[PDB]
A = this chain, B = another copy of it.
Amino acid sequence: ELPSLANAIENMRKFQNSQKLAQAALLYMASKLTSQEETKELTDIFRHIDKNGDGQLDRQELIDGYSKLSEEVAVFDLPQIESEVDAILGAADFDRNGYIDYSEFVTVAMDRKSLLSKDKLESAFQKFDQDGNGKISVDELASVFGLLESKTWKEMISGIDSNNDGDVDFEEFCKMIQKLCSNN
Q: Which residues of A contact B (CB under 8 A)?
A: 1-5, 7-13, 45, 68-71, 84, 87-88, 90-92, 108-112, 115, 182-183
| Contacting pair A8 B91 (CB below 8 A) | yes
Kindly list chain B residues whose C-beta atoms are within 8 Å of the C-beta of A12.
Answer: 87, 90-91
A45 touches B13 (CB 8 A): no
In the complex the two chains form, is B183's CB within 8 Å of A110's CB? no
Decide: A70 near B110, CB < 8 A? Known: A13-B87, A90-B12, A92-B8.
no
Measured between beta carbons, the chain B residues less than 8 angstroms from A111 are: 3-4
Q: How far is the CA of A13 from the CA of B8 in the complex (A)?
A: 22
- Specify the chain B residue showing the minimal Cβ separation from A4: B109
User: A152 CB to closest chain B CB, in angstroms?
Assistant: 12
Task: Determine how many copies of this chain the complex contains.
Answer: 2
> B90 contacts A4, CB within 8 Å?
no
A5-B69, A111-B4 known; A11+B183 contact, CB < 8 A: yes
In whole angstroms, how far apart are the Cα atoms of A71 and B84 in the complex? 46
Tell me, in angstroms, the Cα distance from A3 to B108 when the chains sit together: 10
Bound complex: CA A109 to CA B6 (Å): 8
Inter-chain contact B2/A69, CB cutoff 8 Å: yes
Q: Point out the residues of chain B lying under 8 angstroms from A92, CB to CB.
A: 5, 8
The 8 closest A-B pairs by CB, nearest first: A8-B91, A5-B109, A12-B91, A9-B87, A8-B108, A2-B109, A1-B70, A9-B91
In the docked arrangement, what's the CA distance between A45 and B5, Å?
13
Rounded to whole angstroms, the CA-CA distance of A109 and B2 in the bound complex is: 6
A71 contacts which chain B residues (CB < 8 A)? 1
Contact of A88 among B9, B69, B84, B182 (CB under 8 A): B9
Complex contact A4–B88 (CB within 8 A): no
B contact residues around A90 at 8 Å (CB): 9, 12
